[PDB]
Design a protein around this nucleic acid. Structure first.
Ligand SMILES: [Zn+2]
Lengths: 725, 7, 750, 492
RNA sequence: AGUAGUAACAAGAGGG
RNA sequence: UAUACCUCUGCU
């Protein structure tokens, strides 16, 4: 009706105190007087509540409570009083009033409340339909990272979300702006439909929608899956020393599945290369591995992701590579190279930025359709060459335009005039498909040799034998994979190399379980370091006698293969040479023996060594993108023998205690540090000035010198006479 | 489990 | 055997067993009585560190103002405040070079803010000093009080609604030399009663004009009080509260400094705990990558002594002007206001002191204003000396305090000064045998120094240390220390080749928050949850933390389980509910029901967790939207509590609005004072705002904008709502005339 | 400012500034450094709100749960188990107090309990009780004008606290706090059922923790504090004008399973118009004991000890006759102190997450749940004490109870001294740790740090004992290392 | 007396 | 001046 509201207003406007305020203070100023209070924010609410709960009437409530519940309950407890709460018309009330309501108050209808509180009830839905696996115990590596904390956020900005909320709950009071996107329209109609006729405060509906719609993030330490539904249950899935395997209810998003598939395939390919039979190792891991508790092989059979490592996994399983797609009406099939994808935004000739998914790398397509074919050679925003043919000049030219847009050249972008308004690749296409006059003048022309069968095409539309639009010429797949994972065509030419796979290490969105003997328990490179150095300490006495007696069997242990993926390919050989040479010096120079140095450098053995005689103050290891450096002399971030604990600390994680023998184990001479040299002790100026490691080749055999060996230390060094095996 | 001490 | 817990450190590293050194299960220190002793201590010490500077009497206030900047260079390691303007500007220029376009976009974002910001925005935040009453008051009342007195005199630019116009009114108000303020005072009336005549306390108001000094002194006044509950310190210290005049300017300056700090790797502010750790992890990563295998690394676990007392308002004016270089001069001058008011700031000296006579057995209070003229026979030797030194600075009750700062005045711009010294340490600027990087948040810093030999580190430290002295920063030699990089401490985070847990820091957050039954259950379970994630709270202890919280919650709210033999004021009514209820599992803990929580479901709100298992009638009562217990607040302040770890932030929680979402009774001490009328103002303002929301429902979600009147806006809506409800709807023809007659009747009453 | 450009400004001034302004790195070796100096004075008195190791209980077998029944009814049930009450006599005087008031309060209380007929007991405001609870002892508030010219009107005594010496008793108290008892002091409320495997693992580990912690003597003290402070706070609020009696009760279950109600004594609450969070409530505690106060009279400075009875105590094969004392004293607390006393169960959390992290740290390395091995085997052990034989090691269970005692004692003896001492000495410990990690630590002003620490060691038994503990730890670290350029960083 | 600790509480204000 | 009462307040 709106009859009781205007009646109450006149009744208030009768009061001169109220009419004073209602006229003088503006709509802007009403925000100030609404929050005008004598009440301080409480500094010790914990204390005050313990103090106040001892009192008879600590709760304040609306005075209408006196008409709704009785003054006394059945047992004689006073439920409400008439004492007004300071600064309001509310009255002081007992906790027994809350209990009375809950057991004998008015019942209302609340069956649609789960729709209003959807953000909460979806958490219970996920947990109720969640599945638990086993608990594994291991050093749990946690990367502090910004992640989503609002699973099922329909992704919108705060301003966009405000318009949606206003439309739904306060439909009459919306401002000038309207529902701009179809995201906003579908969400508004759905919310209006779901929340229709639900007796609840509109303030609460507006609140829950605000929390539901707008994306929110936090920096959190995360081991494993980073997806929102996994982030939600970090307390349950990870501790300091344990992983509780768990799959939330509901289906994983394809975005997350594609991201994790790529990571899994790369890790599989990286592991396989360092094994003796890479193709068999890859095949073994593919059959054992699962992503989000789904086997990797059935994912590969139905997932259309195009990526070098994934394609190698598909090749090994004999399943077709997503080698092709269709654009502008024509089917593009890639015959050479690969698509590295970089999402950026570029300025046109109109001075208008656009979010493109620009492609890098040398690529080569066979293109066909609409009575016209072409061989395209393309670089990063570069049409290298297009040899186009077709039944009509109209048709050849149509394909030329499509190719000139598909190139993504700066020529064609800067030749755009006016605004693009009809995905943004098709927005450039439909523009140039209805006017290409500036495109062709701005494209530019080149001279060519007159070859028989080939002709050029000018901007005007004529055919010219020795001139043509830049890069354009006019004229009229079974796959195999070998032992070493090289993917070739029927002609025997390289399509995909394992070596040319992307080195990028991102963290999985969904959980990956390889279930392989070739892999360690946990996913990731920090785990590889810890499990490797843990294994060496655990089986030390076995490996120590295997070091003395039969060293080539020790170096070729397959437990060192995961560690080898962390070493750069080029360095593996020389590091093994340097390592093996340094170990045999400890064997040759009798008396000296450093077990910590053996344990530190032992995993760098596992590769056929090179005979090159270069020097190293550190071996490099690729860990989550950044190179880290394991120092040859003493402790570093990667390897840290801490004598106080008698523990080897690998990237901040205790890896085990070595034998207490090793605490009391030293010698003047240090044998396993420099190739063909021995460290004797402290620096002595008697033996010349200080040198670097690169300057050591000048010393004669037997001659001694001072060296800046590492970490600010300066050291005396002799060149030993005989070399080692 | 019943805890014990040398005492 | 004598038991000694410290001997655990023989086996267990100190970082790994650091929880044993944090005694945070006992009551922290509280100040009893006045903080005037501490406020004078601070004011005296502030001037001692700047004592070689240049004294000058102020033209407008007559306050004796010490200026130490560009003063004599220090000749000892004692706390100095002789910051050199040119050295500051070099560091701020260095910061500009190293981050091209930062100052530009920082200013550009702060420009957009100033345009868009409304006067509303100062209703938010902590208590401000009110010049109207010479006391602390809530932000919004101090705002409304200043607007009222400004409106009563010749100042109404803020009637627009935008904040910059309110800021104009503040600068224009200094020109008035007869500023009028209504005070209040008690009056003892006598009235008959039925047939005896009893005395009656009542309150009436009286107008008072103020001098040009009086008003100006009060607008430059910052309140003082002792900081309570502060851990890790034998002695108490003084803290300060800004006034209403300076606050809106401070907002925009801190906003600039925030936008700067947001894009500086070396700033700890304003990011949270985990991101501070990530930032520290990055500089260690970056320092190790850019060094050679020949080089060394040492880390200073760092503390700056006397941080606020030696940071000068004049230096802050240099920074602000250099950061804003090439921007519009109105924007430079606007942001320059706050540092200027800080340079001419005066401090209220507090409650005063209490005297006692043993032989007579009496006590008496004297104000801090009386410290100027009072006889010194009363005081002890130390207090007497402090009063004699403070008398030289004293100006109409307050004490002048030009140099330095005080705690709780100003935030992030001091970190920018520190970060600029960290930025000086790049290889490409220093070009020495040493170089540095690190992180800073206020007085605390972690500095990493790399060099070729240990002698280079020493030279690096001295260069850092002495450069810091040149901008009024004093590294503590007592509390800072150095070691090889690998372990350090930073704001009670402990790094040992990686950050380790400091769970005992969080121990005071394990308990019953005291908001209400709904919020506390959500808060409590979430404290357990967030500590499992962030501070290595293991699963067994976390289960036990649930158990103990439920015990504490049940006892505190007297809501023991419905089948208990206990006896409280609530046991009988809870028993009635228990026996009446079919599905007991669905009863909330506050209604005598069982605890549902374990590790797996801490993130699920209680009502949500028990919803399937509730009796229909109980659930329908519990979540009844017509219940008289809830305070229907704004959306922006829905499901917010307040917490103290930082200053004093808000904690959002997840809960369904129920009869348990109640609010405890307000404090009633105001009823005995002269400010008693403020309660009635509030009651009247609330009924006015309540009725407006019946015409503008969306005002509870989005603050409505309008220079028009509150009554006139309601009247416009009253007519047109009646129109569409009849024209095409379910309202009769007779009722449209009935509504518009009332609107015309209201329009007649004005 | 707009036209400023850098031109060697800092470099110039760095040349200009005195070379006395520096930060010289002094290398830190813990073999070099001295023990912390503890203050001299009179000995530190007991200052807890209730008796610790010296407490004595009257009890009844009682099926009631961990806080069930009416307190005074339960209290009388406990009194009726004991006969052989004597005419009360003062055996140790409270030197600064009128001791016959303390005696009269006991006799009044006992008689008022006998004559009570209700749920609660409020005592009559007699002279002896008024003195004991500080009735009328606030000076009367006047305006300054009216009292300006009084000769002895000064400001309140605002000196630093009087120094006190470390006494033996506090080390003894801590030893008893770390012990196992035959009773389960803490009953834990229910959890939701375990579903996740990790919840089952948790519960298995929680079984170990629960017994170890519930049976520890420190947990008995937790339960006394939670009861007393809850009772005082609630009565402070509701009965502001009454001198209300609060019996000191705890409930527990044996190892044998029998539920039991214990009575330690009584507390008489003064007036309690508590406004500020520091405002004081005066109370009188009257607590049973078999401890002869004359054997350690410095411990009891604040108490007036009575001899109130004789008890026939049963042993192996001989009934022994011991006198029963009543330790009476006036004491005080505040709303804030009571709040934190009500919350003392969080001490359980402090101990247990340190212990669980130790269990979890090895579990990570060993790749298996090391819960069961740690509690049941004795291969894993940590240094936690000193006998004449040497440094004694304890098992994880012992470590748990020592850490629980530490946390409980931090709560019972909270002070600004402890706050300051704990914060400043942590720096010195970290320097010692840095040295032991072979990280070449350096101090700038080591004398200043020692002063920051030593400034906080004034008069508190707990802070005094912690200072001593640091020195004992320092000395133990020095010995395991010894002289040399390559000292044994590893312990044993 | 006792709490306490760099200054307070040990009721304050009013019916004057 | 004392002794009874009565009223408000317990973070303001
Ligand atoms: Zn209970």
């Amino acid at each position: 009706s709106g009859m009781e509201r205007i009646k109450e207003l006149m009744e208030m406007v009768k009061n001169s105190r109220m009419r004073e305020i209602l006229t003088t203070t503006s709509v802007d100023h009403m925000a100030v007087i609404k929050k005008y209070t004598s009440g301080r924010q409480e500094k010790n609410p914990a204390l005050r509540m313990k103090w106040m709960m001892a009192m008879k009437y600590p709760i304040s409530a609306s005075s209408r409570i006196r008409e709704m519940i009785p003054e006394k309950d059945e047992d004689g407890n006073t439920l409400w009083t008439n004492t007004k709460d300071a600064g309001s018309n509310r009255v002081l009330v007992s906790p027994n009033a809350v209990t009375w309501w809950n057991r004998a108050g008015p019942v209302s209808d609340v069956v649609h409340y789960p729709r209003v509180y959807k953000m909460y009830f979806d958490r219970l839905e996920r947990l109720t339909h969640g599945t638990f696996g086993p608990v594994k115990f291991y050093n749990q590596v946690k990367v502090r990272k910004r992640v989503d904390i609002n699973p099922g956020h329909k992704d919108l900005t705060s301003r966009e979300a405000q318009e949606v909320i206003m439309e739904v709950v306060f439909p009459n009071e919306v401002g000038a702006r309207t529902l701009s996107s179809d995201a906003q329209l579908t969400i508004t109609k759905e919310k209006k439909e779901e929340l229709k006729n639900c007796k609840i405060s509109p303030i609460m509906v507006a609140y829950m929608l605000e929390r539901e719609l707008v994306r929110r993030t936090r920096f959190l330490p995360i081991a494993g899956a980073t997806s929102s539904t996994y982030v939600e249950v970090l307390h349950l899935t990870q501790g300091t020393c344990w992983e509780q395997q768990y799959t939330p209810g509901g289906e994983a998003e394809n975005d997350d599945l594609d991201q994790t598939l790529i990571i899994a395939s790369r890790n599989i390919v990286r592991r396989s290369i360092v094994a003796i039979d890479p193709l068999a190792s890859l095949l073994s891991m593919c059959h054992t591995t699962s992503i989000s508790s789904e086997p990797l092989v059935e994912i590969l059979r139905s997932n259309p992701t195009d990526e070098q490592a994934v394609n190698i996994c598909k090749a090994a399983l004999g399943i077709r590579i997503n080698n092709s797609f269709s654009f502008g009406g024509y089917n593009f099939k890639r015959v050479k190279g690969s698509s590295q994808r970089t999402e950026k935004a570029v300025l046109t000739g109109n001075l208008q930025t656009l979010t493109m998914t620009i492609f890098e790398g040398y690529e080569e397509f066979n293109v066909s359709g609409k009575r016209a074919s072409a061989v395209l050679k393309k670089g990063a925003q570069r049409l290298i060459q297009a040899i186009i043919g077709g039944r009509t000049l109209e048709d050849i030219l149509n394909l030329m335009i499509t190719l000139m847009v598909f190139s993504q050249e700066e020529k064609m972008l800067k030749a755009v005039r006016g605004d693009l308004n009809f995905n943004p690749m098709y927005q450039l296409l439909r523009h140039f498909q209805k006017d290409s006059s500036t495109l062709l003048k701005n494209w530019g022309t080149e001279e060519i040799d007159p070859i028989m069968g080939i002709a050029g095409i000018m901007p005007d539309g004529t055919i010219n034998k020795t001139q043509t639009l830049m890069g354009v010429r006019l004229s009229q797949i079974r796959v195999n994979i070998d032992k070493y994972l090289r993917v070739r065509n029927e002609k025997g030419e390289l399509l995909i190399s394992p070596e040319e796979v992307s080195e990028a290490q991102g963290q999985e969105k969904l959980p990956i379980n390889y279930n392989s003997s070739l892999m360690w328990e946990v996913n990731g490179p920090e785990s590889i370091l810890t499990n490797t150095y843990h294994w060496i300490i655990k089986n030390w006495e076995l490996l120590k006698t295997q070091w003395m007696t039969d060293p080539t069997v020790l170096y070729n242990r397959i437990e060192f293969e995961p560690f080898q993926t962390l070493i750069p390919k080029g360095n593996r050989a020389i590091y093994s040479g340097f390592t093996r040479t340094l170990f045999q010096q400890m064997r040759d120079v009798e008396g000296t023996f450093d077990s910590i140095q053996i344990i530190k450098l032992l995993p760098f053995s596992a590769h056929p060594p090179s005979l090159g005689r270069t020097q190293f103050s550190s071996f490099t290891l690729n860990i989550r993108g950044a190179p880290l450096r394991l120092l040859i002399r003493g402790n570093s971030q990667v390897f840290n023998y801490n004598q106080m604990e008698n523990v080897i600390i690998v990237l901040g994680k205790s890896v085990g205690s070595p034998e207490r023998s090793i605490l009391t184990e030293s010698s003047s001479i240090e044998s396993a540090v420099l190739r063909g040299f021995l460290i004797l002790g402290k620096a002595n100026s008697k033996y010349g000035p200080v040198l670097t490691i690169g300057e050591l080749d000048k010393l004669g055999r037997g001659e001694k010198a001072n060296v800046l060996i590492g970490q600010g230390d300066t050291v005396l060094v002799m060149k030993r006479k005989r070399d080692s095996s | 489990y019943s805890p014990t001490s040398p005492s | 055997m004598d038991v000694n817990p410290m001997l655990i450190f023989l086996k267990v590293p100190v970082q790994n067993a650091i929880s044993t050194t944090f005694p945070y299960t006992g009551d922290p220190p509280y100040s009893h009585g006045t903080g005037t002793g501490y406020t004078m201590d601070t004011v005296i010490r502030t001037h001692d560190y700047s004592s070689r500077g240049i004294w000058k009497t102020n033209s407008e206030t007559g306050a004796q103002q010490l200026n130490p900047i560009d003063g004599p260079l220090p000749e000892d390691n004692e706390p100095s405040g002789y910051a050199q303007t040119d050295c500051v500007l070099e560091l701020i220029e260095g910061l500009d070079r190293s981050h091209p376009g930062l100052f530009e976009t920082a200013c550009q974002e702060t420009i957009d803010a100033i345009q868009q910001t409304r006067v509303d925005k100062l209703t938010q935040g902590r208590q401000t000093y009110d010049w109207t009453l010479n006391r602390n008051q809530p932000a919004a009342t101090a705002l409304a009080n200043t607007i009222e007195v400004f409106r009563k005199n010749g100042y109404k630019l803020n009637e627009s609604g935008r904040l910059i116009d309110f800021l104009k009114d503040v600068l224009l108000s200094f020109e008035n030399d007869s500023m009028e303020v209504t005070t209040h005072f008690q009056k003892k009336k006598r009235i008959r009663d039925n047939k005896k005549m009893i005395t009656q306390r009542t309150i009436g108001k009286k107008r008072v004009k103020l001098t040009k000094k009086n008003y100006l002194i009060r607008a430059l006044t910052l309140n003082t009080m002792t900081k309570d509950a502060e851990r890790g310190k034998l002695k108490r210290r003084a803290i300060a509260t800004p006034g209403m005049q300076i606050r809106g300017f401070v907002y925009f300056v801190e906003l600039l400094a925030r936008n700067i700090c947001e894009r500086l790797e070396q700033s700890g502010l304003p990011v949270g705990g985990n991101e501070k750790k990530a930032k520290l992890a990055n500089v260690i990563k970056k320092m190790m990558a850019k060094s050679t295998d020949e080089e060394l690394s040492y880390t200073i676990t760092g503390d700056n002594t006397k941080w606020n007392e030696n940071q000068n308002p004049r230096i802050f004016l240099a920074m602000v002007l250099r950061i804003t270089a090439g921007q519009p001069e109105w924007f430079r001058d606007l942001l320059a206001v706050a540092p200027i008011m800080f340079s001419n700031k005066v401090a209220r000296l507090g409650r005063g002191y209490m005297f006692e006579s043993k032989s007579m057995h009496l006590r008496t209070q004297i104000s801090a204003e009386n410290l100027s003229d009072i006889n010194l026979r009363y005081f002890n030797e130390d207090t007497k000396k402090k009063i004699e030194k403070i008398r030289h600075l004293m100006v109409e009750g307050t004490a002048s305090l030009s140099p330095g700062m005080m705690m709780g005045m100003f935030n992030m711009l001091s970190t920018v000064l520190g970060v600029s010294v960290l930025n000086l340490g790049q290889r490409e600027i220093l070009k020495r045998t040493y170089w540095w990087d690190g992180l800073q948040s206020s007085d605390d810093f972690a500095l990493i120094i790399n060099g070729h030999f240990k002698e280079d580190i020493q030279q690096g430290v001295n260069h850092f240390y002495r450069t810091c002295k040149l901008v009024g920063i004093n590294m503590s030699q007592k509390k800072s220390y150095i070691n090889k990089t690998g372990t350090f401490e930073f704001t009670s985070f402990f790094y040992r080749y990686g950050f380790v847990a400091n769970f005992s820091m969080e121990l005071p957050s394990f308990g019953v928050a005291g908001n209400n039954e709904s919020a506390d259950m959500s808060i409590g379970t979430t404290v357990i949850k967030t500590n499992m994630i962030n501070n290595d709270l293991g699963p067994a202890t976390a289960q036990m933390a649930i158990q103990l919280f439920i015990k504490d919650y049940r006892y505190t709210y007297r809501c023991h389980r419905g089948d208990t033999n206990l006896e409280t004021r609530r046991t009988k009514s809870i028993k009635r509910l228990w026996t009446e209820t079919i599905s007991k599992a669905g009863l909330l803990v506050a209604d005598g029901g069982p605890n549902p929580y374990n590790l797996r479901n801490l993130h699920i709100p209680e009502v949500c967790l028990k919803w399937s298992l509730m009796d229909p009638d109980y659930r329908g009562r519990l979540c009844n939207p017509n219940n008289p217990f809830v305070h229907h607040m704004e959306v922006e302040s829905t499901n917010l509590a307040v917490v103290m770890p930082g200053p004093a932030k808000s904690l959002e929680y997840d809960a369904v609005a129920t009869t348990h979402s109640w609010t405890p009774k307000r404090n009633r001490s105001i009823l005995n004072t002269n400010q008693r009328g403020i309660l009635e103002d509030e009651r009247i303002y609330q009924k006015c705002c309540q009725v407006f929301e019946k015409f503008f429902p969306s005002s509870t979600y989005r603050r409505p904008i309008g220079m028009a009147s509150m009554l006139d806006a309601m009247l416009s809506r009253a007519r047109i709502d009646a129109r569409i409800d009849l024209e095409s709807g379910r309202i009769s023809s007779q009722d449209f005339s009935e509504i518009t007659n009332t609107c015309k009747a209201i329009e007649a009453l004005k | 400012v707009s036209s400023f450009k850098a031109n060697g400004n800092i470099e110039a001034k760095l040349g200009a500034m005195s070379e006395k302004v520096n930060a010289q790195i002094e290398s830190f070796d813990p073999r070099t450094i001295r023990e912390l100096e503890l203050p001299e004075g009179k000995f530190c008195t007991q200052r807890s709100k209730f008796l610790l190791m010296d407490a004595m209980k009257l009890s009844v077998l009682n099926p009631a749960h961990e806080g069930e029944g009416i307190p005074m009814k339960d209290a009388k049930a406990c009194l009726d188990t004991f006969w052989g009450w004597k005419k009360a006599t003062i055996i140790k005087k409270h030197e600064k107090g009128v001791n016959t008031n303390y005696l009269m309060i006991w006799e009044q209380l006992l008689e008022s309990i006998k004559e009570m007929e209700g749920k609660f007991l409020n005592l009559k405001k007699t002279n002896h009780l008024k003195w004991g609870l500080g009735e009328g002892q606030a000076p009367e508030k006047m305006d300054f004008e009216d009292c300006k010219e009084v000769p002895d009107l000064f400001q309140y005594k605002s000196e630093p606290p009087e120094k006190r010496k470390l006494a033996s008793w506090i080390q003894s108290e801590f030893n008893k706090a770390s012990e196992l008892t035959n009773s389960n002091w803490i009953e834990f409320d229910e959890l939701g059922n375990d579903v996740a495997p990790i919840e089952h693992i948790a519960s298995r580990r929680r079984n170990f923790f629960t017994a170890e912690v519930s049976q520890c003597r420190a947990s008995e003290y937790i339960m006394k504090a939670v009861y007393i402070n809850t009772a005082l706070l609630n009565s402070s609020c509701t009965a502001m004008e009454e001198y209300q009696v609060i019996p000191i009760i705890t409930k527990c279950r044996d190892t044998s399973g029998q539920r039991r109600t214990n009575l330690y004594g009584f507390i008489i609450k003064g007036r309690s118009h508590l406004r500020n969070d520091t405002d004081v409530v005066n109370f009188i505690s009257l607590e049973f004991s078999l401890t002869d106060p004359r054997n350690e009279i410095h411990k009891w400075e604040k108490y007036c000890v009575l001899e109130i009875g004789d008890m026939e105590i049963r042993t192996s094969i001989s009934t022994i006759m011991k006198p029963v004392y009543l330790y009476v004293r006036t004491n005080g607390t505040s709303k804030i102190k009571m709040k934190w006393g009500m919350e003392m169960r969080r001490c359980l959390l402090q101990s247990l997450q340190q212990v669980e992290s130790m269990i979890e740290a090895e579990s990570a390395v060993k790749e298996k749940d090391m819960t069961e091995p740690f509690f049941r085997n004795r291969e894993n052990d940590w240094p936690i004490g000193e006998s004449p034989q040497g440094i004694e090691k304890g098992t994880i269970g012992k470590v748990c109870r020592v850490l629980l005692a530490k946390s409980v004692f931090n709560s019972i003896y909270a002070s600004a001294q402890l706050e300051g001492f704990s914060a400043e000495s942590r720096k010195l410990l970290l320097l010692i740790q840095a040295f032991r990690d072979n990280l070449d630590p350096g101090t700038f002003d080591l004398k200043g740090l020692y002063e920051a620490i030593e400034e906080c060691i004034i008069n508190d038994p707990w802070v005094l004992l912690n200072a001593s503990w640091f020195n004992s730890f320092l000395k133990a670290v020095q010995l395991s290392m010894g002289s040399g350029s390559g000292e044994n960083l590893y312990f044993q």
